[PDB]
Amino acid sequence: RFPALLAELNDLLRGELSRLGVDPAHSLEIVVAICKHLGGGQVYIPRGQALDSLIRDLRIWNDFNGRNVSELTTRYGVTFNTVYKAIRRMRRLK
DNA sequence: TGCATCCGTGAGTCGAGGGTAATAATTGAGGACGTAAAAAAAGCCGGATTAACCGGCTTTACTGTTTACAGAA
Fold first, then answer.
1. Are residues A42 and A71 in the same domain?
2. Does the CB of A42 sit below 7 A from strand B?
3. Burial class of residue A86 in the structure, from the number of CB atoms within 10 Å of its CB (0-12 exposed, 13-18 middle, 19+ buried)
4. Å: A17 CA to B8 C1'
5. How far is the CA of A86 from the C1' of B65 (A)?
6. Both A41 and A6 in a single domain?
7. Distance measured from the CA of protein residue A33 to the C1' of nucleotide B9, in angstroms
8. What is the DSSP annotation of A27-74?
9. Is residue A42 domain-shared with residue A53, that is, in the same domain?
């Protein structure tokens, strides 16, 4: 499982470096670096699901300024309970 | 004892119209009492609203295996 996934990861890293102006071969260093600092065991790579919901609520209350909460339920289709919890959360943070 | 006098009795299934009518006075007063109309309950009726979720994906903690270079007749 490791070889093909590592190869694709290196391909994407070098593509992103080329897009950003960095030399693609520098990606090897990057992956080597992460291969030193990310080991320890077996765990699947996902995303920031907590951060995904965090930025979702961020966008929700950035678009929210009143009645457009209904538009929020029309934006993607979500509950008013989570929207109200997110509003209270944005009130909590300063 | 003969006489009038009175009192039940006497068929049955069926159909189609099925209702008609001699007569008659007005005032006044008084009160009851029904019925609309307009207003409070009051009773839901519409639209947002905070706290109950209970299956399910995603890491940590183990768990029985799966190979090629060092030890024993």
1. no
2. yes
3. buried
4. 134
5. 48
6. yes
7. 135
8. HHHHHHHHHHHS-SS-------HHHHHHHHHHHHHHH-SSTTHHHHHH
9. no
Through-space separation of residue A22 CA and nucleotide B36 C1' in angstroms? 92
What is the structure's resolution, reported in angstroms to one decimal?
Answer: 3.8
Overall domain count for chain A: 2
How far is the C-alpha of A45 from the C-alpha of A78, rounded, in Å? Answer: 27
Find the nucleotide nearest A82 (Cα to C1′).
B50
**Alpha carbon of A38 to those of A19, A34, A42, A47: distances in Å?**
25, 5, 10, 15
Tokens standing for residue A25: 């071969």
CB A22 within 8 A of CB A1: no
